Amino acid sequence: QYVRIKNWGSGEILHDTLHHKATSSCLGSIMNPKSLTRGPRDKPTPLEELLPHAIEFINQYYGSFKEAKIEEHLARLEAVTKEIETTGTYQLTLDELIFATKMAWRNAPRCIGRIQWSNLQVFDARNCSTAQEMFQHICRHILYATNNGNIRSAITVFPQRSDGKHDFRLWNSQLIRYAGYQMPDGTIRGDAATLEFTQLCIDLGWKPRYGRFDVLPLVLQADGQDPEVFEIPPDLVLEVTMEHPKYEWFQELGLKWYALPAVANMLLEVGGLEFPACPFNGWYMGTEIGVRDFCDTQRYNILEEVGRRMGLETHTLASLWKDRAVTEINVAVLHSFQKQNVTIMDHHTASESFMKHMQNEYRARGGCPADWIWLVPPVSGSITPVFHQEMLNYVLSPFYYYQIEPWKTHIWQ
Amino acid sequence: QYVRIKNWGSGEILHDTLHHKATSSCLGSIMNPKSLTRGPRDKPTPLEELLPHAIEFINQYYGSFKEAKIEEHLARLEAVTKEIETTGTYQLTLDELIFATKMAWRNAPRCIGRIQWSNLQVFDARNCSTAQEMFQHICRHILYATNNGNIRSAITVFPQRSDGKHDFRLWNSQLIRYAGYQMPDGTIRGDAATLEFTQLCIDLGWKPRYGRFDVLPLVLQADGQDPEVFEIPPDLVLEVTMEHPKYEWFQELGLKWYALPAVANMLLEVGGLEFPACPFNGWYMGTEIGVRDFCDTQRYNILEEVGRRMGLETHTLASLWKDRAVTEINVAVLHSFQKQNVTIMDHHTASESFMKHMQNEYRARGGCPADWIWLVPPVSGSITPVFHQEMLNYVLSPFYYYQIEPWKTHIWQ
Ligand code: HEM
Ligand code: HEM
Ligand SMILES: N#Cc1ccc(C(=O)N2CCC3(CC2)N=C(N)c2c(F)ccc(F)c2N3)cn1
Ligand SMILES: N#Cc1ccc(C(=O)N2CCC3(CC2)N=C(N)c2c(F)ccc(F)c2N3)cn1
Ligand SMILES: C[C@H](O)[C@H](O)C1=Nc2c(nc(N)[nH]c2=O)NC1
Ligand SMILES: C[C@H](O)[C@H](O)C1=Nc2c(nc(N)[nH]c2=O)NC1
Numbered sequence A, B: 001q002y003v004r005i006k007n008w009g010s011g012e013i014l015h016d017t018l019h020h021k022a023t024s025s026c027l028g029s030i031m032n033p034k035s036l037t038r039g040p041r042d043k044p045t046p047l048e049e050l051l052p053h054a055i056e057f058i059n060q061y062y063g064s065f066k067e068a069k070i071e072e073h074l075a076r077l078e079a080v081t082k083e084i085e086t087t088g089t090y091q092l093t094l095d096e097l098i099f100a101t102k103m104a105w106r107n108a109p110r111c112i113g114r115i116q117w118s119n120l121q122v123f124d125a126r127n128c129s130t131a132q133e134m135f136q137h138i139c140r141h142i143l144y145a146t147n148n149g150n151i152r153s154a155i156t157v158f159p160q161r162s163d164g165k166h167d168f169r170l171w172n173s174q175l176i177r178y179a180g181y182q183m184p185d186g187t188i189r190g191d192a193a194t195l196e197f198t199q200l201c202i203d204l205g206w207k208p209r210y211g212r213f214d215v216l217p218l219v220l221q222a223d224g225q226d227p228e229v230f231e232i233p234p235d236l237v238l239e240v241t242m243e244h245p246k247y248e249w250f251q252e253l254g255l256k257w258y259a260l261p262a263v264a265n266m267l268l269e270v271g272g273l274e275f276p277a278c279p280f281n282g283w284y285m286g287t288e289i290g291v292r293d294f295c296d297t298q299r300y301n302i303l304e305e306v307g308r309r310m311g312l313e314t315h316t317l318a319s320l321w322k323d324r325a326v327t328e329i330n331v332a333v334l335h336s337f338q339k340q341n342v343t344i345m346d347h348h349t350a351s352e353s354f355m356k357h358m359q360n361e362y363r364a365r366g367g368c369p370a371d372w373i374w375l376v377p378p379v380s381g382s383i384t385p386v387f388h389q390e391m392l393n394y395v396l397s398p399f400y401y402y403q404i405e406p407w408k409t410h411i412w413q
Helices: A047-062 A070-087 A094-106 A131-149 A192-203 A286-295 A303-309 A321-339 A347-365 B047-062 B070-087 B094-106 B131-149 B192-203 B286-295 B303-309 B321-339 B347-365
Strands: A003-007 A012-016 A121-124 A154-157 A180-182 A188-190 A218-221 A228-230 A239-241 A256-258 A267-270 A273-275 A399-401 B003-007 B012-016 B121-124 B154-157 B180-182 B188-190 B218-221 B228-230 B239-241 B256-258 B267-270 B273-275 B399-401
Touching: A012 B347, A047 A070, A047 A094, A094 A121, A094 A154, A094 A267, A094 A399, A121 A131, A131 A154, A131 A218, A131 A228, A180 A192, A188 A192, A239 A321, A286 A321, A303 A321, A321 B321, A347 B012, B047 B070, B047 B094, B094 B121, B094 B154, B094 B267, B094 B399, B121 B131, B131 B154, B131 B218, B131 B228, B180 B192, B188 B192, B239 B321, B286 B321, B303 B321
Parallel strands: A121 A154, B121 B154
Antiparallel strands: A003 A012, A180 A188, A218 A228, A239 A256, A267 A273, A267 A399, B003 B012, B180 B188, B218 B228, B239 B256, B267 B273, B267 B399
């Protein structure tokens, strides 16, 4: 009929008709494509499908170590199929999970930091059973990963999807994230990008502090039950206050940001099995905060303000005052993280390391999936090596999929 | 077998194997895809194919003006098919060509300036027959478009492809473009991106001036004969010398650039007909010169040099000295063009106008093909509106196709 097109800036929509008159239509510039999303279930995974996938993964796993172990491999293959026809699903051995979590990461086409893929702490919470236990595991994760500034990459894997109506899910987009409130005077305080979720939290019994940087609460759902609201212990949320190395009025903007970048709502697919709850984290890249979180119009939007305090021709696009401001903001962020001894990386050194990663990856296993639109930084694109690098974007497995917003598809006793 | 991947930065190559283990492989990040290229011929266009295309175009054309002219439409349809079965091919009426050139432009998914699509001078050189006449038409084009700085968009359409072995072709990538020479001391002077073509020119009897900014000659081929070398009259090549509004040492870098951005080697497809020679031009966008031509490693590469003269920590990526330098370079360019009264636009105002264009385009004809990777500026991407804009990239018609390098596929009496 017609393809829907969204402008994530003004949130406006457009309906494309013309594409029909095409000749021989790329979905690359699409943020959330269905090919990347892995939705719900109602019944277990049809044995005919699971079995093959499961075998494939076990061959990948065993076909991983130098000088394999054929006996164990056969036995394992044997043991798994056996366990499958006896229960339907199956259980991965800790080592397979670890292998799975790293490989899935390794296969994340949108991750600039995959050079670290082998360095990953894996917390086994597959035995978790209640929301309080989830909350406890998450806190442990947040504490371990934060490590007082010296950030450590980590993932915590909760129970796998069984039937499809007993899914463990984190409703938050990320572990730490500020709240956004619609104020009475018509203005929006905090992170406008979370106005909805903040409200959902308000709705579930959360007390709004009406501030610019109130860390939203964890909204966990275990087994299949409704989500319970858990506030995050302030002692666990490390933050960096922003200050510019030259302009002393920067800190006057009273800005800050959390140090832990952790994705909360993705699904880990492996060997036919799927874990809809597996929060993981790495560390920040300056431009994420300096450019996206601070300069996006749909976000904190401090560009106009920084330009004025800089004495720039804020009313003349051609003056390139925006390019000037954004740069100082980016340096304030980097500066601030470095000063407070909190791990972070600039987009430049990041691009170089990815290029190195990619080089290794092609040698090692001839290939490395990569989404160019996502790997090129939001600023200074061609100044970066990855911009001049052609790359293929394909979905391997194990893989980390996006999934449907839990509040769209969910019961509610 | 395996997909070839090129890094246009270090020119290195990579062979992708992994993509085979894919699930449900995007070619978006590919510079020159075959789907966008339109190669050679040996025999005319099979009547069965041409006829339908021709009818389609004539319906588009007539189905263009408000309150159509059914009589003329039928007559025209009638007249064309008639002319087709009598000659094989057919001739477009000046108005159809004009309509075709604008629509093709309108359908260029990689053009940030399509808001100007209706403003276009069309030079009818379909009667051209010799290389000297091509040279004359080109000179006229260069003179008209340059207009002493007040740049005007223009295209000159030479004879259409007949059999396939009587093609008019410009061997140059663009009308004006500096030469690159491999020096005896191992260094490369001028534009390294034209080392090959410069040599080809040398080979065809061109005298190399061994300078940093020697405008390469026109290498025209008419009918089907070999290419003849025509040097461009210096009086016709307008240039802007670079100088920074604050740093007076900028002009000490002794830099400049031509004012006329004109593509020379593309092919215009319309109504089944194809014109392999139709140089066209618009005006420059600062970042093209300041960022790509001056800061690309494979080009003039003046970033390192500008950073030092700025007194930046040139040996510390994290300092973001590159982001600082690039900005001043961009301002020098804009500044210099403005000072010398030569049309140019900054990437910011450009992005805003495209967004407006796109808005109009969807309203008018519900859709507007757009290649995101090409529309987002090489620097300050997310600071621009088009970065947050989702878009579809499809090939309509009439369209401007890329084509195979003439020196790869050509006779040679
Ligand atoms: C060790 C440092 C790491 C760094 C610096 C890093 C950095 C990044 C950055 C900058 C993005 C861009 C996100 C955006 O633009 O929204 C990203 C995406 C991604 N990363 Fe990494 N990462 C790291 C570790 C990890 C780990 C440990 C995993 C998982 C095991 C991982 C999985 C992913 C995935 C799935 C995406 C896509 C997220 C999405 O599409 O929203 N990364 N990462
Ligand atoms: C009036 C002002 C115009 C401006 C400012 C403009 C600007 C641009 C820019 C900045 C690009 C990017 C090129 C690159 O990154 O290599 C581009 C591409 C393109 N433009 Fe425009 N343009 C204009 C007029 C035109 C005209 C008159 C035509 C043709 C009738 C046209 C056809 C195209 C095509 C086919 C491309 C793709 C070129 C390629 O793929 O190499 N443009 N233009
Ligand atoms: N609008 C908005 C918006 C979106 C995401 C966030 C956010 O907190 N995100 C944190 C996670 C995010 C992306 C930024 N940033 C990272 N370094 C990162 C990481 F280290 C590992 C894995 C990821 F998937 C990562 N993506 C904040 N605001
Ligand atoms: N390496 C390299 C390299 C490539 C192209 C050029 C060059 O001269 N190009 C001039 C034409 C180029 C792209 C830049 N720049 C434009 N504004 C432009 C235009 F106004 C109309 C149509 C185009 F297709 C256009 N593309 C210089 N160096
Ligand atoms: C529309 C456009 O694709 C989108 O707004 C962009 N967002 C992102 C992106 N790249 C990253 N890293 N993160 C994003 O969210 N690419 C482009
Ligand atoms: C590899 C990468 O796609 C390529 O080097 C880039 N070149 C260009 C681009 N965008 C424009 N406008 N021009 C280019 O030549 N997109 C990216």
